[PDB]
Design a protein around this ligand. Sequence first.
Ligand SMILES: [Cl-]
Length: 460
Amino acid sequence: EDFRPVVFVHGLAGSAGQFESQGMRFAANGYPAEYVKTFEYDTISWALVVETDMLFSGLGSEFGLNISQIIDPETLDKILSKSRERLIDETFSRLDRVIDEALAESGADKVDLVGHSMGTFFLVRYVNSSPERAAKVAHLILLDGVWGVDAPEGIPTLAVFGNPKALPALGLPEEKVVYNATNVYFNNMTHVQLCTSPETFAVMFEFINGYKPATTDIVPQDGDYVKVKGKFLAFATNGDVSGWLSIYPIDENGKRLTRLPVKFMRVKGDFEVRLRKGQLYEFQFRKDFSPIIYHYYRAPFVRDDLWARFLVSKPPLDVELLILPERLSPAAKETSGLLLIRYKEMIGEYDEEIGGVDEVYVNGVNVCTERICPIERAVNGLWVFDRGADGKSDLDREVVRYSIMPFMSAADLVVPAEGTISIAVKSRTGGEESFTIPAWSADRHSIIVQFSDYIVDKLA
Ligand SMILES: [Cl-]
């Protein structure tokens, strides 16, 4: 049996990340790893400059609208004043090039396209832009995005929808339906969860090949060394980010097992490295013109991953600024700053349809309350710092500066910069995950811990 390449188009504030576990699920099922292609683009210019089209009644922009608030007036003016048409020629061109180099390197003739959130809106404009394009497409998958339109002409369509409750920005929907297509609904999944979900990988595999797949678990591959091919790129705009990568292996408490790194390298966007399967690692990144030190943490690589993404904070959506006032008080040398990420909504409020709530333990305190991670917010990024630098942990006063940010939320917690910190998460879909890392100083360090979208319960 033979597979055809797949291209993945992220949604607003998204990236290849949302399709990293999917790329590995396809891998263990035969798919040669280098076939799962991700297409990244400027989610901020797209939603602002294109999706404010009347083509879907301005329905795609909704999300770029809110997130743009943080933009500097001069720079936002610059953005909107870009030519709507040229940015679509340019961009859809880069997608052609990408799809070609696909068929070409694989020998197949048709490819399968996947779209998520604003990304669905993207794909559709694309497949309907001409015949020659709709020609090079085998099947089309539209994850929890556009609805209320007819699927492209003569091209097998698949559209999956999650619980709308966790997606305010799309509104009053009685039934999400992409006409004449195969519709699948998981009313027990939230927006991004549904993109990285295993239960959603199955439906995907079947619809594009013709048969359910062997497994949907992340399979630890034979061997001692895995190949990671990631990228340090700017949040939301996905531009390449320049810096220095130092890799230090560590023990169950974040302490470095070597005095020097096992890898130190110049990075300008993309990067490749060979690492030991199942080994804990700390990714220390120093971005250009920022004296801040970034400590990236996550679960070990049980197998080749060619879609790892490390998100950096850059202009125009310099999201790290909102935390700036604080990083600057002398209080900072006494607290630690954390960013908890999980491409699977961390819910703090119960909802029958959803089925549960997660718990995120930072130093014993659970920071995934009902007022910090309500479903509406669809929390994927979570900042944990000393709000105000008062040294007091008001966990009931929601940090307001994230009100507007899509997919984020924060929480006023004090995490002592002495010894270590302990993040422990009991996922709402069963399974705990836990990390213990050095408690770095908020004055010179930022800490990014990334939870795994997939988590097993070999007993439940
Ligand atoms: Cl605030």
